[PDB]
Design a protein around this ligand. Structure first.
Ligand code: NAG
Lengths: 380, 49, 125
């Protein structure tokens, strides 16, 4: 029995469902992963600390979970201190912090390559501060270096109850500067809100171009802006054309909705897929640890997480490396990690929205950058 | 029809739509309210009474 | 976290101290939870967090008013990511209304006008 801690945010049903499905798929007779699940407010540092200390006191060998920008420092610090490996689908940490396994690939490079692909020199960058500002720094450095005109506006601070008034105002500002090209790097709901307002005022017509900067493009609702005439480009880390993803979806679309909330659909959010893939990665990690005849079994209790002075357990490093040397094939494509826990050798599909629905025009490789995939009237 | 008009962007200034039914306020008017197009209708139920 | 828990275990009535951008959330959360007042010279919290007494006044308004005073339209904004981006986001939100062209460089076009926004040591460098 290998005890691990799960940390799930309140409301992530599909992610936890994909967690359970991943637990069922990758279960084996060799060893058995035993999850301890904590459902909490992920933006709360106190709750995250308490949960972490609880899982640690229980003596877990690894911790899967999510974090916000308000709780990320606590995770990285505690995991880097107590040497407890953390697995996450959430945004990549800004830095080289140890004992953190990020399932989410970097989106900045693909975004920049997409900006260069459409040859934009002047555009608007709408962004949410909830994930990180690293991408903002990236587009600002590239704005300076490539001599661009970028209007970066923060929509994170505005309250949702009075939001439509400030939306109308900001769009009045964007119509003032003649801005026809906008990038949404936001939360999917925030993206939905901005899109809804774009549709309301009518800036979703021809001449406008929107780049949704998220891992899944098809994860949100694209039908309302599909027939508008505006070019809508996005990213997709989950390719539904793969046989693996095809089969996984064939089972996922038939799963019981009563037992698994939000698991009866033909598509799946990239976070849930990264959760599934995370379960796979952990399984392979412990499997490799057992294959290398390396004993990680705890001799005694882990004790209090705040014990002074704090002494990290020795096999934690062994577990960390064991998680970072794993190279497998999941829903997110090729899963391989560098020593810092970052995703390497991955592929992010570049998608375009047409009348017949979303279509892939190319892809962005980790080393190869952006590569493209290769009724007319009479003339008198 | 309203959703499609909004989708293609014909709900802006210069357009005028007349809803011919007894209730004007019975449906959702919020989506075409900020478009800029003039929208006229009929109301048989006076909520001021 | 350990220091805060130690001081709390000692039974202090108030806590004076400093925090970084990586440790600010811990302070605000724990102090907001245990109703223990925190006093700090460090940067003001981004929000309405309770039980936090910030001695340092806000610099956003004075900075914006100063930029508007010199009648600046196009300029470069140098910033430290080790310190923070809050004032930067402020001038970026204000850039559209006041018609500004800002070139943001992280220190962590013939530009003749520069904003530094750093630590006194980094500023000296
Ligand atoms: C990525 O890893 C795969 C195997 O998973 C390998 O065949 C391929 O050469 C690697 N490509 C790059 C660009 O590193």
């Amino acid at each position: 029995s290998i005890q691990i801690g799960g940390l799930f945010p309140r409301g992530a049903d599909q992610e936890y469902s994909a967690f359970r499905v991943g637990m069922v798929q990758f279960s084996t007779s060799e060893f058995r992963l035993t999850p301890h699940i904590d459902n909490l407010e992920v933006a709360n540092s106190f709750a995250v600390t308490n949960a972490f200390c609880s899982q640690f006191s229980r003596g877990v060998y690894a911790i899967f979970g999510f974090y916000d920008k308000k709780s990320v420092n606590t995770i990285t610090s505690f995991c880097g201190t107590l040497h407890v490996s953390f697995i996450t689908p959430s945004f990549p940490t800004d830095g080289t912090h140890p004992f953190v396994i990020q399932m989410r690939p970097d989106l900045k490079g693909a975004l920049l390559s997409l900006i260069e692909y459409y040859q934009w020199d002047k555009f608007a960058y709408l962004y949410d501060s909830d994930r990180g500002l690293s991408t903002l720094q990236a587009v600002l450095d590239s704005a300076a270096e490539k001599k661009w005109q970028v209007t970066a506006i923060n929509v994170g601070n505005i309250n949702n109850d009075k939001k439509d008034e400030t939306y109308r105002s900001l769009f009045q500002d964007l119509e003032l500067k003649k801005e026809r090209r906008v990038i949404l790097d936001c939360e999917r709901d925030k993206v939905n809100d901005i899109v809804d307002q774009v549709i309301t005022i009518g800036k979703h017509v021809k001449g406008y171009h929107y780049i949704i900067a998220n891992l899944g493009f098809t994860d949100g609702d694209l039908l309302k802006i599909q027939f508008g005439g505006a070019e809508v480009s996005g990213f997709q880390i989950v390719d539904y054309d793969d046989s693996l993803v095809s089969k996984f979806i064939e089972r996922w679309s038939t799963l019981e909705e009563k037992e698994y909330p939000g698991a009866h659909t033909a598509t799946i959010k990239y976070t849930s897929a990264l959760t599934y893939d995370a379960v796979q990665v952990m399984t392979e990690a412990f499997r490799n640890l057992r294959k290398q005849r390396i004993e990680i079994s705890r001799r005694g209790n882990a004790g209090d997480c705040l014990a002074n002075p704090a002494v990290p357990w020795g096999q934690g490093v062994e577990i960390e490396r064991a998680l970072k040397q794993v190279q497998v094939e999941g829903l997110s494509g090729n899963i391989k990690f560098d020593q810092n826990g970052k995703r390497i050798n991955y592929t992010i599909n570049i998608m375009e929205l047409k009348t017949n629905g979303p279509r892939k025009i190319g892809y962005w490789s980790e080393v190869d950058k952006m590569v493209v995939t290769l009724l007319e009237q009479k003339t008198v």
